[PDB]
């Protein structure tokens, strides 16, 4: 399988229903290592690495394909078809779940529901939409980017994860963050910050479980309610007693039981 190897696909567990696990920026499928053992006896589990992750071949990273989020959506579709999966339960962190939302638009037959950890359709504020970052504030960061990539990559990590440099979560996050090729991570960073999925949320019809931290510098709690009001299908919002943008990594004791509930229960 050329597509399975390029994305380091792993298949665990068994069952009529498949849980697909998609990771966020700067991580890979190993971020799910504490959730997977609670799924394998009741579901088949599919794990894949998004293109551009440190565990994938840099040469495969097409800068135009992955300058728009649906480039990732098409990869997900190709993986699901290759491994004979339909009507899956997709669990995704951050733009991975947004890539699966758009994937569900193209191929509703591939998704039974979406469990979304810290999703946002747009980071930039406008006159009606508070994404958490003013245009001027975001612009004077992206110009920094490759000239000061190390400082931005690591310097924003403690605020993003909301945990210490000595913590295991920060250590594990930086382990995978530091393996990305800088020009790939700048391209992906520039796509996420420039993303505006708001015009298309009404065409997402698959049920969506929106899981949030009560304090996420990247996702204001109102962004979750915005998603819920603008998705075209059913949705539920759960704001966890967590902080940081990667609560499945930094606070698994709270987050994993929440994720399992939304995996097991339908809206
Ligand atoms: Mg071959
Ligand atoms: Mg992300």
Residue numbers in the entry: 2 to 268
Could you pull the original sentences from the published paper?
Strigolactones (SLs) and karrikins (KARs) are two classes of structurally related molecules that mediate signaling pathways to stimulate seed germination. SL and KAR have been reported to be recognized by the homologous proteins D14 (DWARF14)14–17 and HTL (HYPOSENSITIVE TO LIGHT; also known as KAI2, KARRIKIN INSENSITIVE2), respectively. To elucidate the structural basis of ligand specificity, we determined the crystal structures of ShHTL1, ShHTL4, ShHTL7, and ShD14 and compared their structures with those reported for ShHTL331 and ShHTL529. All the structures were highly similar to one another, consisting of a canonical α/β hydrolase domain and a helical cap.
Y150 was changed to F150 in a subgroup (ShHTL4, ShHTL5, and ShHTL7) of the divergent clade, thus losing the hydrogen bond between helices αD1 and αD3. Therefore, helices αD1 and αD2 of ShHTL4, ShHTL5, and ShHTL7 slid away from αD3, resulting in larger pockets with a reduced chance of causing steric hindrance with ligands. This finding is interesting because ShHTL4, ShHTL5, and ShHTL7 have been shown to be highly sensitive to various natural SLs (polyspecific receptors) in a previous study. In the divergent clade (ShHTL4, ShHTL5, and ShHTL7), ShHTL7 had the largest pocket. For example, ShHTL7, with the largest pocket, had the helix αD1 tilting the greatest extent away from the entrance of the pocket. Structural analyses revealed that although the cap domains of ShHTL7 could overlay well with those of ShHTL4 and ShHTL5, with a root-mean-square deviation (RMSD) of 0.9 Å, ShHTL7 had more non-bulky residues than ShHTL4 and ShHTL5, such as T142, L153, and T157. It is reasoned that ShHTL7 evolved to use smaller residues to enlarge its pocket while sustaining activity. To verify the importance of pocket size for ligand recognition of ShHTLs, a double mutation T190F/C194F and a triple mutation L124F/T190F/C194F of ShHTL7 were generated to introduce large side-chain amino acids to reduce the pocket size by partially mimicking ShHTL3. The inhibition constant Kirac-GR24 in the YLG competition assays was used to indicate the rac-GR24 binding affinity of ShHTL7. It is shown that the T190F/C194F mutation led to a twofold decrease, and the L124F/T190F/C194F mutation led to more than a 100-fold decrease in the rac-GR24 binding affinity. Our results showed that rac-GR24 triggered the interaction of ShHTL7 with ShMAX2, which was consistent with the results of a previous study.
